[PDB]
Design an enzyme around this catalytic site. Structure first.
Site, mmCIF file in Angstrom:
data_model
loop_
_atom_site.group_PDB
_atom_site.id
_atom_site.type_symbol
_atom_site.label_atom_id
_atom_site.label_comp_id
_atom_site.label_asym_id
_atom_site.label_seq_id
_atom_site.Cartn_x
_atom_site.Cartn_y
_atom_site.Cartn_z
ATOM 1 N N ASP A 74 55.893 68.026 -1.481
ATOM 2 C CA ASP A 74 56.339 67.528 -0.187
ATOM 3 C C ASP A 74 56.493 68.681 0.796
ATOM 4 O O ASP A 74 57.185 69.662 0.513
ATOM 5 C CB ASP A 74 57.663 66.778 -0.346
ATOM 6 C CG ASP A 74 58.103 66.087 0.932
ATOM 7 O OD1 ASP A 74 57.334 66.086 1.917
ATOM 8 O OD2 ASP A 74 59.228 65.545 0.954
ATOM 9 N N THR A 111 53.659 66.178 8.042
ATOM 10 C CA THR A 111 54.320 67.479 8.002
ATOM 11 C C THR A 111 53.328 68.607 7.739
ATOM 12 O O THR A 111 53.222 69.553 8.528
ATOM 13 C CB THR A 111 55.417 67.473 6.935
ATOM 14 O OG1 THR A 111 56.396 66.478 7.261
ATOM 15 C CG2 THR A 111 56.091 68.834 6.855
#
Lengths: 519, 528
Positions: free
Chosen positions: B54, B87
């Site tokens: 992530d 992101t």
């Protein structure tokens, strides 16, 4: 064995003056990209660990904290530029530093700095006289009240991300200045709150004051957020059930006494809590948190409350409804209360915002800004600050001079002709002063990406042809008249800049030695 | 003050150091961009070791003093609230613009012309994607949920979810429908509670409308279910911050008992307190008593005779979550009880999970609520956090699909179509923009080449293969082979990204690239 300084560094001679020149260039070189509306922004990291990025020379030099004495003088004169005027702190240091660069070859030739400083004082005395000749008195002449404020704000907002939405932003910018007394205009009286999310064109102007609505405590779906004429009560102390800090030691052996001391802690709080209702105020504002017990008791009587409000926002509430802050709930007097025309809590930006609206006693206002990102809105707010200062000084100062290179060239133009009548060292000193005035239009083209060689030379041509108003167009690269392009600055800025830059230059050139005591 | 510990980068050597510094930070998460991307080992300051791909976690776990890289963190911080899945994509795209900007600086182009060049490059590329976008909900409702369910299955294929992904994809669909209205069409992630616990597997993770307090009902003899109580309205419960028992002092106890007489007198105070508390429950018409603190055993014995199941030790934030679902209120004391302050639900029961000794509770509704709780389980800690954040990533996609019906197939397709359109219009502009638009198209090509490098394919060969299929045949969405199929088409493969998500990704990336070039001087002081 004996020593004169006892280990306290002191250096003198012509090398100390050169060391003062290198310090002025270092301060100038940092402020060169920050000159102009299109100029680049500087990245400054303070020892406080707060990262700030701004092009305003005032804020820049205040956060650098340069220990060097000759470089600190350029910071002190910039704070005077922020005091006497408040705008142009970037150009006053660059121009003062350019006088140090042009005086550098004179120091190598053996020319005394006192004749150099005397030459600038005669050049500025002639420069201020030419500014008075370039001062144009205009109020109602070939302009209306609405067109004067709008057309000047469009230029300051041009060449920005707001260029397309500028039509909506000029309306809120002009109404913001007109919302205040035209006799005294303060940029601090115009509030600006950034709202993350939403479209840029949907921004609203608030006649009163608004804040963040920091109240985090439960009890929602009550305390109606829309009032007509609410009575605003400013509070100090803490009404929460379970307190923040203090406590007490109570020893009881009975079960009924266990509930008694819990009800006692409730009764002591409910006492001052009920006194809030006895005042009969719909809005309860406090700089300290308003707990669940207080917001629940206010919900039954339909009283709205918001806790932990910033002190900077509470001071504007006093300037809005004309209220006053009372410490306790007992002695609250009726004149400390205040009321607006409308009160509503807006969900704009997926966040709740309280706002006061329609305050006739309000000496301050609030302008909300919206956009797709918080960083873009911050650029909109700063591009608005540059637009507010132009609209503000337009009403406060009716004497204007053409800016954007126009006035800078005319002052440098005539002083080259005035130097022909003066013979001796003062001739090359005035010529160096007029050459030092060429850095202002230069850096404006270099910071905006324009070619400094072609545009400046072409600017020296048409300006020498008998038209004094030719500036540098910041939109489409070319030479042109800024009087038509409406790039305007008051005459007090150009006069105070030449006076402050030469003053700081004369203070640094007069320093032979720097004595620094250690301890 | 303090001349030392102050460095200044300006002019020539500043522009080269800023791009190479942002490239080193971007090169970290380049290999982590994709469904096939590579994980990283992150060590917390307490010493815990975690492994996740992530980007929001990696950029937050990384502690850096680089101010230019802090702007990259602020870039992913603002988009995480808006989207959350872009992101790692926005930083590589922004650095690709910086790498092309550094090449333009070496050619003699000012950074202001580069910033204005990338600005007109984004406005042109948005218009090209606006013409090629497609709509889903504009067709049919059952077909919308068909594309909606299969869209969540795509985003969950890069996680351990991929095994059971059919179940978690239905969870993302059902959880959003309950927190949204047909007329409002507003999807808020705060209305969806994400909760998970260690143990079990991902196959045991259900989706329940309500809240779970993880309690055994304080006593075994109390019934495992709660009845409607003979024609009452739902099941009424109490939300209070005070326990059901005689209250205890929070400072010192030290109760002195002289003889047996004083001990028998406290028995009456403890017994009469029980009757005063139970009567407040019967008068208010409440069934289950939920409190913040534990209960007395002697008090639970009288609750068995009065048929009043109780729940003890419920957190303050957990008490507020019941008031949202059951439309209740937090009541400070027993004498403040009222019918309007009691939470009204359908029923309360203790649901047993396999042989696990947890035995949590479930409060239900049987009508559309203002909040939902996603129940997540996993065989390990990191498995629970991965399945929870992967489901939250799907919820952010569903939120964008409902807010904007315009959709495009984003993997490997968008950056190529954007590049082919800008490259053709670069010759018509004839100026500084021609170098800015050509580098803009080459910077867009970094994303699909990065995906090909993470999937084990030739980044040069795959990129051009996608171009020739979108030129010789027709302009459409044909993406990278990362997930795998018989062909590279993103349409039949059901890989879709929100059009409003792709527009904000290419916007904030160009915006920060102009802000980095906006900085011509960097002065950093020390720590005093």
């Amino acid at each position: 064995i004996v020593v004169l300084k006892e280990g306290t560094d002191a250096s003198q001679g012509k090398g100390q003056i050169i060391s003062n020149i290198n310090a002025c260039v270092a301060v100038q070189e940092a402020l060169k990209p920050t000159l102009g509306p299109l100029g680049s922004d500087i990245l400054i990291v303070t020892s406080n660990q707060k990262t700030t990025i701004s092009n305003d020379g005032a804020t820049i030099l205040k956060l650098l904290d340069v220990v060097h004495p000759a470089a600190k003088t350029l910071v002190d004169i910039s704070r005077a530029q922020d005091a006497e005027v408040g705008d142009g702190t970037t150009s006053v240091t660059i121009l003062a530093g350019e006088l140090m660069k042009e005086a550098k070859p004179f120091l190598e030739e053996g020319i005394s700095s006192h004749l150099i400083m005397k030459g600038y004082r005669k050049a500025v005395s002639l420069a201020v006289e030419k500014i008075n000749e370039l001062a144009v008195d205009i109020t109602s002449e070939k302009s209306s009240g609405r067109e004067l404020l709008e057309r000047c704000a469009r230029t300051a907002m041009s060449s920005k991300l707001i260029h397309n939405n500028a039509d909506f932003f000029v309306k809120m910018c002009v109404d913001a200045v007109l919302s205040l007394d035209r006799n005294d205009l303060d940029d601090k009286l115009i509030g600006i709150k950034k709202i993350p999310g939403g479209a840029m064109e949907e921004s609203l102007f608030i006649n009163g004051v608004a804040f963040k609505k920091t109240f985090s405590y439960a009890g929602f779906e009550q305390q109606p957020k829309k009032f007509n004429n609410p009575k605003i009560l400013s509070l100090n102390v803490e009404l929460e059930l379970k307190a923040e800090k203090d406590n007490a030691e109570v020893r009881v052996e009975h079960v009924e006494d266990y509930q008694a001391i819990v009800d006692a802690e409730w009764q002591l709080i409910f006492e001052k809590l009920r006194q809030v209702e006895e005042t009969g105020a719909n809005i309860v504002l406090s700089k300290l948190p308003i707990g669940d017990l207080a917001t629940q008791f206010f919900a039954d009587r339909n009283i709205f409350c918001a806790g932990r409000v910033s002190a900077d926002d509470m001071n504007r509430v006093i300037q809005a409804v004309g209220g006053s802050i009372q410490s306790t709930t007992s002695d609250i007097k009726p004149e400390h209360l205040g009321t607006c025309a409308l009160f509503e809590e807006m969900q704009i930006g997926s966040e709740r915002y309280n706002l006061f609206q329609g305050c006739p006693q309000a000496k301050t206002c609030t302008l909300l800004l919206r956009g797709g990102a918080e960083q873009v809105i911050a650029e909109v707010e700063r591009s608005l600050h540059d637009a507010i200062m132009i609209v503000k000084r337009a009403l406060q100062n009716k004497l204007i001079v053409a800016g954007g290179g126009a006035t800078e060239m005319e002052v440098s133009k005539c002083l080259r002709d005035y130097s022909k009548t003066i013979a001796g060292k003062q001739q090359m000193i005035i010529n160096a002063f007029a050459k030092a005035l060429e850095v202002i239009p230069r850096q404006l083209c270099e910071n905006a990406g324009f070619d400094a060689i072609e545009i400046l030379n072409k600017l020296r041509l048409a300006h020498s042809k008998g038209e004094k108003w030719y500036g540098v167009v910041f939109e489409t690269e070319n030479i042109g008249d800024n009087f038509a392009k409406f790039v305007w600055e008051p005459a007090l800025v150009k006069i105070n800049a030449l006076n402050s830059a030469t003053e700081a230059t004369n203070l640094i050139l007069s320093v032979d030695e720097t004595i620094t005591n250690k301890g | 003050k303090d001349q030392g510990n102050k460095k200044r980068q300006h002019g020539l050597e500043a522009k080269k150091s800023h791009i190479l510094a942002a490239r080193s930070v971007a090169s970290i998460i380049k290999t982590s961009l994709g469904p096939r991307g590579l994980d990283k080992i992150l060590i917390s300051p307490d010493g815990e070791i975690t492994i996740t791909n992530d980007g929001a976690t990696i950029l937050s776990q990384m502690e850096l003093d680089n101010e230019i890289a802090k702007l990259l963190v602020q870039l992913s911080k603002s988009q995480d609230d808006e989207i959350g899945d872009g992101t790692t994509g926005v930083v590589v795209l922004a650095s690709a613009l910086l790498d092309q900007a550094l090449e333009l600086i070496q050619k003699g182009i000012h950074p202001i012309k580069i910033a204005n060049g990338f600005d007109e490059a984004a406005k042109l590329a948005i218009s090209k994607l606006e013409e090629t976008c497609d709509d889903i909900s504009a067709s049919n409702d059952e077909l919308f949920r068909d594309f909606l369910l299969r869209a969540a299955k795509t985003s969950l294929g890069s996680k351990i979810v991929s095994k059971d992904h059919d179940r978690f994809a239905e969870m993302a669909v059902e959880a959003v429908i309950n927190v949204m209205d047909k007329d409002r069409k507003d999807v808020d992630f705060d209305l969806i509670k994400m909760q998970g616990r260690v143990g079990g597997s991902i196959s045991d993770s259900k989706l329940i409308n309500g809240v779970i307090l993880d309690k055994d009902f304080s006593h075994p003899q109390m019934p495992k279910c709660v009845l409607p109580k003979e024609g009452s309205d739902g099941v009424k419960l109490a939300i209070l911050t005070c326990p059901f028992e005689p209250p205890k002092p929070k400072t010192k106890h030290k109760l002195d008992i002289s003889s047996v007489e004083e001990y028998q007198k406290l028995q009456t105070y403890e017994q009469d307190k029980f009757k005063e508390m139970i009567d407040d429950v019967k008068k208010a018409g409440a069934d289950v008593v939920i409190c913040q603190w534990g209960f007395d055993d002697e008090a639970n014995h009288l609750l068995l005779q009065n048929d009043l199941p109780a729940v003890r030790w419920v957190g303050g934030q957990e008490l507020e979550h019941i008031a949202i679902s059951t439309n209740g209120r937090i009541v400070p004391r027993f004498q403040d009880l009222s019918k309007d302050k009691l939470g009204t639900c359908s029923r309360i029961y203790e649901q047993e999970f396999g042989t696990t000794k947890d035995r949590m509770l479930i409060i239900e509704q049987s009508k559309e609520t203002k909040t939902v709780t996603c129940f997540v389980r996993g065989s390990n800690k990191m498995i629970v956090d991965e399945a929870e954040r992967a489901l939250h990533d799907s919820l952010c996609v569903v939120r964008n699909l409902v807010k904007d019906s315009r959709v495009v197939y984003g993997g490997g397709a968008a950056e190529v179509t954007m590049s082919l359109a800008v490259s053709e219009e670069a010759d018509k502009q004839r100026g500084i923009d021609q170098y800015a638009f050509r580098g803009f198209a080459q910077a867009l090509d970094t994303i699909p080449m990065t995906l090909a490098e993470n999937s084990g394919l030739d980044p040069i060969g795959t990129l051009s293969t996608l171009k020739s299929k979108q030129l010789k045949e027709k302009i459409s969405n044909i993406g990278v082979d990362c997930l795998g199929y018989g062909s590279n088409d993103m349409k039949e493969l059901f890989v879709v990204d929100p059009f409003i998500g792709k527009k904000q990704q290419i916007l904030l990336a160009t915006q920060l690239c102009r802000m980095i070039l906006k900085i011509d001087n960097v002065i950093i002081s020390g720590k005093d």
